[PDB]
Design a protein around this ligand. Structure first.
Ligand SMILES: [Zn+2]
Length: 123
């Protein structure tokens, strides 16, 4: 099953956002990132995707279809806007085993606030 995510200059959480910023998925699902506004892409954050998952980085302004297979948590960023908090969390399966690690990892303050928000909303 496919989940669509919009890449935006501005949205509900402020500037430089993925909508949704939390994607709940199962193995074999696709997540389709749509460049509604220009200037955006999607890239896996290093040491913030599951064991066995392949890193990725899409082309700026490209419609990108990510297939997620490995269970666990994936923190993805918009490469230019990571420092402005432009991130999404993908959770594949229940109780993603690497979520607490990702939460504890070094990352921009604004990214952290946004990440904690979607985790709390998902509970
Ligand atoms: Zn961006």
């Amino acid at each position: 099953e496919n989940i669509e995510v919009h890449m935006l200059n501005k949205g509900a959480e402020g500037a430089m956002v993925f909508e949704p910023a939390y994607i709940k998925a199962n193995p074999g699902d696709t997540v389709t990132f749509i460049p509604v506004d220009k200037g955006h892409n999607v890239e896996s954050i290093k040491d913030m995707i599951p064991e066995g998952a392949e890193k990725f980085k899409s082309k700026i302004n490209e419609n990108y279809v990510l297939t997620v297979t490995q269970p666990g948590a994936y923190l993805v960023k918009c490469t230019p806007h990571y420092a402005m908090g432009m991130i999404a969390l993908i959770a594949v399966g229940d109780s993603p085993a690497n979520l607490d690690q990702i939460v504890s990892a070094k990352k921009p303050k604004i990214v952290q606030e946004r990440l904690e928000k979607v985790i709390a909303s998902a509970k």
